[PDB]
Design a protein around this motif. Structure first.
Motif, mmCIF file in Angstrom:
data_model
loop_
_atom_site.group_PDB
_atom_site.id
_atom_site.type_symbol
_atom_site.label_atom_id
_atom_site.label_comp_id
_atom_site.label_asym_id
_atom_site.label_seq_id
_atom_site.Cartn_x
_atom_site.Cartn_y
_atom_site.Cartn_z
ATOM 1 N N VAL A 6 0.809 -0.983 0.179
ATOM 2 C CA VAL A 6 -0.094 0.011 -0.065
ATOM 3 C C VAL A 6 0.811 1.217 0.017
ATOM 4 C CG1 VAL A 6 -1.865 1.304 1.326
ATOM 5 C CG2 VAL A 6 -2.005 -1.328 1.042
ATOM 6 N N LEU A 7 1.932 1.302 0.790
ATOM 7 C CA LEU A 7 2.610 2.531 1.129
ATOM 8 C C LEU A 7 3.304 2.629 -0.311
ATOM 9 C CD1 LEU A 7 4.089 1.823 4.585
ATOM 10 C CD2 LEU A 7 2.750 4.088 3.675
ATOM 11 N N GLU A 8 3.939 1.691 -1.057
ATOM 12 C CA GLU A 8 4.442 1.860 -2.448
ATOM 13 C C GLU A 8 3.560 2.604 -3.325
ATOM 14 O OE1 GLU A 8 7.764 1.169 -2.157
ATOM 15 O OE2 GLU A 8 6.805 0.659 -0.250
ATOM 16 N N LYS A 9 2.082 2.171 -3.411
ATOM 17 C CA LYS A 9 1.313 2.618 -4.356
ATOM 18 C C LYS A 9 1.063 4.358 -3.950
ATOM 19 C CE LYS A 9 -2.802 0.884 -4.017
ATOM 20 N NZ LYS A 9 -3.964 0.415 -2.981
ATOM 21 N N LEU A 10 1.034 4.626 -2.654
ATOM 22 C CA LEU A 10 1.019 6.035 -2.068
ATOM 23 C C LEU A 10 2.188 6.851 -2.264
ATOM 24 C CD1 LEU A 10 -0.730 5.386 1.438
ATOM 25 C CD2 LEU A 10 -1.917 5.587 -1.048
ATOM 26 N N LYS A 11 3.301 6.384 -2.876
ATOM 27 C CA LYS A 11 4.460 7.279 -2.986
ATOM 28 C C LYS A 11 4.127 8.418 -4.116
ATOM 29 C CE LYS A 11 7.986 4.142 -1.436
ATOM 30 N NZ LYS A 11 9.132 3.202 -2.024
ATOM 31 N N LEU A 12 4.700 9.337 -3.952
ATOM 32 C CA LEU A 12 4.665 10.503 -4.843
ATOM 33 C C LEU A 12 5.676 10.161 -5.896
ATOM 34 C CD1 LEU A 12 4.340 13.660 -2.753
ATOM 35 C CD2 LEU A 12 2.372 12.202 -3.545
ATOM 36 N N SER A 13 4.943 10.639 -7.087
ATOM 37 C CA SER A 13 6.075 10.250 -8.607
ATOM 38 C C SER A 13 6.909 11.498 -8.360
ATOM 39 C CB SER A 13 5.237 10.455 -9.718
ATOM 40 O OG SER A 13 5.871 11.046 -10.686
ATOM 41 N N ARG A 14 8.369 11.329 -8.638
ATOM 42 C CA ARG A 14 9.404 12.404 -8.934
ATOM 43 C C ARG A 14 9.043 13.401 -9.976
ATOM 44 N NH1 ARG A 14 11.903 7.749 -6.751
ATOM 45 N NH2 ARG A 14 13.614 8.441 -5.326
ATOM 46 N N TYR A 237 -4.649 7.584 4.331
ATOM 47 C CA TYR A 237 -5.446 6.967 3.105
ATOM 48 C C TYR A 237 -6.898 6.058 3.918
ATOM 49 C CZ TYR A 237 -5.436 3.908 -1.236
ATOM 50 O OH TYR A 237 -5.755 3.362 -2.340
ATOM 51 N N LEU A 238 -6.832 5.634 4.671
ATOM 52 C CA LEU A 238 -8.006 4.910 5.329
ATOM 53 C C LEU A 238 -9.070 5.734 5.332
ATOM 54 C CD1 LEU A 238 -9.399 2.638 6.810
ATOM 55 C CD2 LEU A 238 -8.363 3.273 8.854
ATOM 56 N N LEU A 239 -8.832 7.088 5.682
ATOM 57 C CA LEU A 239 -9.854 8.028 5.869
ATOM 58 C C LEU A 239 -10.336 8.454 4.682
ATOM 59 C CD1 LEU A 239 -11.846 9.517 7.663
ATOM 60 C CD2 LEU A 239 -10.095 11.349 7.755
ATOM 61 N N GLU A 240 -9.202 8.668 3.505
ATOM 62 C CA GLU A 240 -9.535 9.377 2.494
ATOM 63 C C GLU A 240 -10.602 8.004 1.746
ATOM 64 O OE1 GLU A 240 -6.561 10.552 -0.475
ATOM 65 O OE2 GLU A 240 -5.614 11.960 1.182
ATOM 66 N N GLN A 241 -10.105 6.937 1.667
ATOM 67 C CA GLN A 241 -10.810 5.756 0.981
ATOM 68 C C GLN A 241 -12.461 5.711 1.672
ATOM 69 O OE1 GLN A 241 -9.208 5.531 -1.876
ATOM 70 N NE2 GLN A 241 -8.985 3.042 -1.455
ATOM 71 N N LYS A 254 -17.824 15.336 7.942
ATOM 72 C CA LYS A 254 -17.067 16.380 8.913
ATOM 73 C C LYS A 254 -15.933 15.745 9.335
ATOM 74 C CE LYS A 254 -21.317 18.508 10.535
ATOM 75 N NZ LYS A 254 -20.981 19.837 10.200
ATOM 76 N N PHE A 255 -15.309 14.520 8.805
ATOM 77 C CA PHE A 255 -13.912 13.916 9.111
ATOM 78 C C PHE A 255 -13.156 14.500 8.272
ATOM 79 C CE2 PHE A 255 -17.181 11.104 11.224
ATOM 80 C CZ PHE A 255 -16.548 11.180 12.401
ATOM 81 N N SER A 256 -11.937 14.754 8.748
ATOM 82 C CA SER A 256 -10.857 15.408 7.978
ATOM 83 C C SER A 256 -9.514 14.628 8.136
ATOM 84 C CB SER A 256 -10.824 16.901 7.807
ATOM 85 O OG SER A 256 -9.979 17.222 8.777
ATOM 86 N N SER A 257 -8.483 14.644 7.157
ATOM 87 C CA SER A 257 -7.111 14.375 7.769
ATOM 88 C C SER A 257 -6.661 14.863 8.898
ATOM 89 C CB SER A 257 -6.054 14.548 6.367
ATOM 90 O OG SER A 257 -6.168 15.896 6.284
ATOM 91 N N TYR A 258 -7.161 16.120 9.441
ATOM 92 C CA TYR A 258 -6.478 16.622 10.552
ATOM 93 C C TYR A 258 -7.213 15.886 11.816
ATOM 94 C CZ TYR A 258 -4.744 20.416 13.652
ATOM 95 O OH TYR A 258 -4.038 20.887 14.710
ATOM 96 N N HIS A 259 -8.099 15.238 11.765
ATOM 97 C CA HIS A 259 -8.572 14.367 12.877
ATOM 98 C C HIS A 259 -7.516 13.293 13.119
ATOM 99 C CE1 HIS A 259 -12.522 16.154 11.776
ATOM 100 N NE2 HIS A 259 -12.119 16.508 13.113
ATOM 101 N N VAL A 260 -7.020 12.709 11.845
ATOM 102 C CA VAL A 260 -6.416 11.369 12.020
ATOM 103 C C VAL A 260 -4.588 12.137 12.248
ATOM 104 C CG1 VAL A 260 -7.342 9.728 10.777
ATOM 105 C CG2 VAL A 260 -5.915 11.086 9.577
ATOM 106 N N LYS A 261 -4.470 13.415 11.821
ATOM 107 C CA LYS A 261 -3.042 13.779 12.111
ATOM 108 C C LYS A 261 -3.049 14.126 13.688
ATOM 109 C CE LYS A 261 -0.167 17.488 10.555
ATOM 110 N NZ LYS A 261 -0.184 18.955 9.919
#
Ligand SMILES: Nc1ncnc2c1ncn2[C@@H]1O[C@H](COP(=O)(O)OP(=O)(O)NP(=O)(O)O)[C@@H](O)[C@H]1O
Ligand SMILES: Nc1ccc(-c2cc(Cl)c(Cl)c3[nH]c4c(c23)CN(C(=O)CO)CC4)cn1
Ligand SMILES: [Mg+2]
Ligand SMILES: [Mg+2]
Ligand SMILES: [Zn+2]
Length: 342
Positions: A6-14, A237-241, A254-261
């Motif tokens: 999963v983390l490999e798929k989440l990597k940003l392309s250079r 990614y869990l929350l985004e999905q 109302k949930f956002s990535s700031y909740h997981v952060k």
């Protein structure tokens, strides 16, 4: 190994990084130059914030968060309605004064107006968050947030926040508390009290995430490659999905990535040693983050990391039914090895 994949798929392309960094720079630099011509914004400066500059942006570099910070000397704050995070500010800013009060809405309106008039780039402005949000080339979103910088001591609502002493050190906590704090033109509910500003420590969130270990050499060599950022990326990614799958369910709006952060910072406080984030324990460390977040949902408690009496999971902000709905979906995912990751 599933999570590593999963983390490999989440990597940003250079290549996407190189292209996006230039597109953003062209827009940000142009707007900074224009704003400095206005008497009110002459001293604006750039502060890069959010997940791209914390290196926890996932999937694509298509969303960037920048503060256009403005030093304002001699501010006096007045907390609004015991909200702990929202304040009136009193003392070329006279144009924004209502009496002695520096109006957040008036300063934001002029800032937005100047940006709107200024925008080799296709740039549009998204409808009116404290941010002015731009979309570059129909692909890259940029949140541009006016921020007042105050070099005074942090407000009293933060006295018991930033509980990093057992993890990053008491000396670091003291150093961080000597840094400025920011106020952004996000208004308290009232209807909104349109003069009110909101306290922000986004710069300190970046400092922590980019200097995140108990060891000063965490993540600087192959023997100290901890899994802290990987765990935040997986929680994001869990929350985004889930939000994407359930996009037509109001319960997740109302949930956002700031909740997981925020939950993630609390887990780092609970688990301060680098050996509690060993790369070979990725699945267990991710599980610790998921179970902590489930505990927050169940107890309806997620304190802001800097402002402990601001509870992000208060029923005033998020209904109980919504927290129970998210609990159900995350429990299903945990119980089934995270099928939303496949
Ligand atoms: N509810 C909030 N309370 C306080 N600060 C917040 C809140 N929401 C967002 N912020 C701040 O705004 C920054 C940018 O927000 P945003 O772009 O939504 O998230 P992010 O951290 O960049 N992660 P991403 O989903 O990858 O963009 C965050 O990093 C926080 O510092
Ligand atoms: N560049 C930045 C950084 C920090 C803040 C920010 C700060 C505070 Cl204190 C609060 Cl409560 C905030 N709420 C939101 C933001 C924000 C920004 N934001 C997004 O970035 C959405 O992608 C929306 C929602 C703003 N812009
Ligand atoms: Mg962001
Ligand atoms: Mg943003
Ligand atoms: Zn590390």
């Amino acid at each position: 190994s599933k999570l590593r994949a999963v983390l490999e798929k989440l990597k940003l392309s250079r290549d996407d990084i190189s292209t996006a960094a230039g597109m953003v720079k062209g827009v940000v630099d142009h707007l900074l130059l224009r704003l400095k011509c206005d008497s009110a914004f002459r001293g604006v400066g750039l502060l890069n914030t959010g997940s791209y500059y914390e290196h926890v942006k996932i999937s694509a570099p298509n969303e960037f968060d920048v503060m256009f910070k403005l030093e304002v000397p001699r501010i006096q704050l007045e907390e609004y309605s015991n909200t702990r995070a929202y304040y009136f500010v009193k003392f070329p800013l006279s144009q924004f004064l209502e009496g002695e009060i520096l109006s957040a809405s008036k300063m934001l309106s002029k800032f937005r107006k100047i940006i709107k008039e200024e925008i080799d780039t296709d740039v549009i402005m998204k409808r009116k968050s404290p941010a002015v949000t731009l979309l570059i080339s129909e692909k890259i979103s940029v949140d541009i947030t006016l921020a007042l910088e105050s070099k005074s001591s942090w407000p009293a609502s933060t006295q018991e926040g930033l509980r990093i002493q057992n993890w990053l050190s008491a000396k670091v906590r003291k150093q961080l508390r000597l840094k400025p704090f920011y106020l952004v033109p996000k208004h308290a509910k009232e209807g909104f009290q349109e003069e009110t500003w909101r306290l922000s420590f986004s710069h300190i969130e970046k400092e922590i995430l980019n200097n995140h270990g108990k060891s000063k050499t965490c993540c600087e060599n192959k023997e100290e490659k901890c899994c802290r950022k990987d765990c935040l990326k997986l929680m994001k990614y869990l929350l985004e999905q889930l939000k994407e799958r359930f996009k037509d369910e109001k319960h997740l709006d109302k949930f956002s990535s700031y909740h997981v952060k925020t939950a993630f910072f609390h887990v780092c406080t609970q688990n301060p040693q680098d050996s509690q984030w060993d790369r070979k324990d990725l699945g267990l460390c991710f599980d610790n983050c998921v179970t902590y977040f489930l505990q927050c949902l169940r107890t309806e408690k997620l304190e802001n990391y800097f402002i402990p009496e601001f509870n992000l999971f208060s029923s005033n902000l998020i209904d109980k039914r919504s927290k129970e709905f998210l609990t159900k979906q995350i429990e299903y995912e945990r119980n089934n090895e995270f099928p939303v990751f496949d």
